[PDB]
Design brief:
This protein is of the alpha+beta class. The protein contains nine helices and 19 strands. The structure holds 2-oxopentadecyl-CoA, the ligand COc1cccc(COC(=O)c2oc3cccc(OC4CCNCC4)c3c2C)c1, chloride ion (CL) and magnesium ion. The site of magnesium ion has 8 residues, from helix 3. The site of magnesium ion (MG) has 8 residues, from helix 3. Heterodimer composed of NMT and AK2; AK2 myristoylation stabilizes the complex. It catalyses: N-terminal glycyl-[protein] + tetradecanoyl-CoA = N-tetradecanoylglycyl-[protein] + CoA + H(+).
């Protein structure tokens, strides 16, 4: 389109394409002492608000904002419905800053109508490891859309991040903006087939009757890796090493510390599931997925789609296909209707054999203030939430 906000930002032009050997900021040499110390102006009757995610009430108000106003599917039949407990997990990682959790309230009602967040994470992009901010959960109330509020939120978080002497960020969106480093399609592996058909997430063709669709997706309730168990505190060193060593091969991935591994993977009911296979006290395989339910808009029978999203999966003792079959099965065991993944890492390789369907769109990966060659998604080794 025209991208009049994005064009003033340190990000590539729509027509920019860089050699593999390019790996550097757009703007280097930045200075904390020069960063604006004043908050971005909001329109009359609107105020900044510092959200304390560890306060139940503040967390609940972010949760209602996103519940009613967050990302929908193209046909406006489903809306992402991140739980409050998920938000807590997502936003309170190691060394997080409360003042990168940014709310906008409407003066007169005192109601939260806008939100944007970031967490600090070490990102390796093309073998350069950079302190970055991972930005998520940008949201403006449906009644206030197209008012140019989203650039005010962006600019204000950029200012807040810059104050910490961080100059790059990482983010994903479904919408095309200037300009993806990678673009990954999503795929859906049906578990509760009939519910999926009923709510219009999946469809039948005459070759596929209801009974046939149900047989097609039926799994065996027996793991390929018999000893796969919920991760415990004792497993953090092992997971750190297994995941840490695996991720080195990709062009884009998070460099997790131990403290990060514990946060990111220790299980929490209805938010994050990690399973491990220990052999001789060494952690040899792992599976992880997170819970992201979709609210079903206007379906008489169901109000929630229970969905599991693939997180980080590593196998040394089985085929990746066997690993990801077990991950489908562990998801089913925890009541999920569907197992979603992106075509990142080695995922695409198993999608056909494990009966994933292609979805309807793709997820773009972005860096802010970084110049580098774009790449196919199989070179992406990071999953954002
Ligand atoms: C070094 C530190 C750096 C930190 C900062 C890093 C950057 C982080 C960037 C944030 C990454 C967030 C990642 C994330 O959370 C994950 S992606 C999901 C974002 N949330 C949703 O899609 C929920 C529903 N929609 C809304 O809330 C509104 O439509 C939002 C708020 C999306 C835009 O509100 P609006 O009422 O529809 O629009 P205006 O206010 O009038 O603004 C229009 C301007 O916003 C640009 N826009 C629209 N959607 C965008 C998006 N998803 N990313 C970036 N930019 C987006 C748009 O292109 C236009 O700029 P342009 O004229 O150049 O084209
Ligand atoms: C059925 O429910 C919905 C609700 C809203 C939108 C859509 C359409 O996008 C997908 O159906 C969709 O499927 C995916 C599978 C893996 C990872 C994905 O993106 C991540 C995780 C979610 N937040 C941002 C980064 C996705 C998405 C966005 C489907
Ligand atoms: Cl400005
Ligand atoms: Mg707006």
């Amino acid at each position: 389109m025209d991208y009049k906000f994005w064009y003033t930002q340190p990000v590539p032009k729509i027509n920019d394409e860089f050699n593999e050997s390019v790996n550097e900021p757009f703007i280097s040499d930045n200075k904390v002492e020069d960063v604006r110390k004043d908050e971005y102006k909001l329109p009359p009757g609107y105020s900044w608000y510092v959200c304390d995610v560890k306060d139940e009430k503040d967390r609940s108000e972010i949760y209602t904002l996103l519940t009613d106003n967050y990302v929908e599917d193209d046909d406006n039949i489903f809306r992402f419905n991140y739980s409050a407990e998920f938000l807590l997990w997502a936003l309170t990682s190691p060394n997080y800053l409360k003042t990168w959790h940014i709310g906008v309230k409407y003066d007169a009602s005192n109601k939260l109508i806008g939100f944007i967040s970031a967490i600090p994470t070490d990102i390796c992009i093309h073998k350069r490891t950079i302190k970055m901010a991972e930005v998520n959960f940008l949201c403006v109330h449906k009644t206030l859309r197209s008012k140019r509020l989203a650039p005010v939120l962006i600019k204000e978080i950029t200012r807040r991040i810059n104050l910490e002497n961080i100059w790059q960020a990482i983010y994903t969106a479904g919408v095309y903006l200037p300009k993806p480093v990678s673009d990954a399609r999503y795929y859906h592996r049906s578990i509760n087939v009939k519910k999926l058909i009923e709510i219009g997430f999946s469809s039948l063709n005459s070759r596929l009757t209801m009974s046939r669709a149900i047989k097609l997706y039926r799994v065996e309730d027996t793991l390929n890796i018999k000893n796969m168990r919920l991760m415990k505190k004792k497993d953090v060193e092992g997971v750190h090493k297994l995941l840490g060593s695996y991720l080195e091969q990709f062009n884009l991935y998070a460099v997790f510390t131990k403290e990060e591994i514990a946060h990111w993977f220790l299980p929490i009911e209805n938010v994050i599931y990690t399973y491990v296979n220990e052999e001789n006290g060494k952690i040899k395989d792992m599976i992880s997925f997170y819970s992201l339910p979709s609210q079903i808009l206007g379906n008489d029978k169901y109000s929630t789609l229970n969905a599991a999203y693939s997180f980080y999966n590593v196998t040394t003792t089985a085929t990746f296909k066997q690993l990801m079959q077990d991950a489908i099965l562990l998801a089913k065991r925890n009541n999920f209707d569907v197992f979603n993944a992106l075509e990142v890492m080695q995922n695409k390789s198993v999608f056909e054999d494990l009966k994933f369907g292609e979805g309807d769109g793709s997820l773009k990966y972005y860096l802010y203030n970084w110049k580098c060659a774009s790449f196919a998604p199989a070179h992406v080794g990071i999953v954002l939430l």
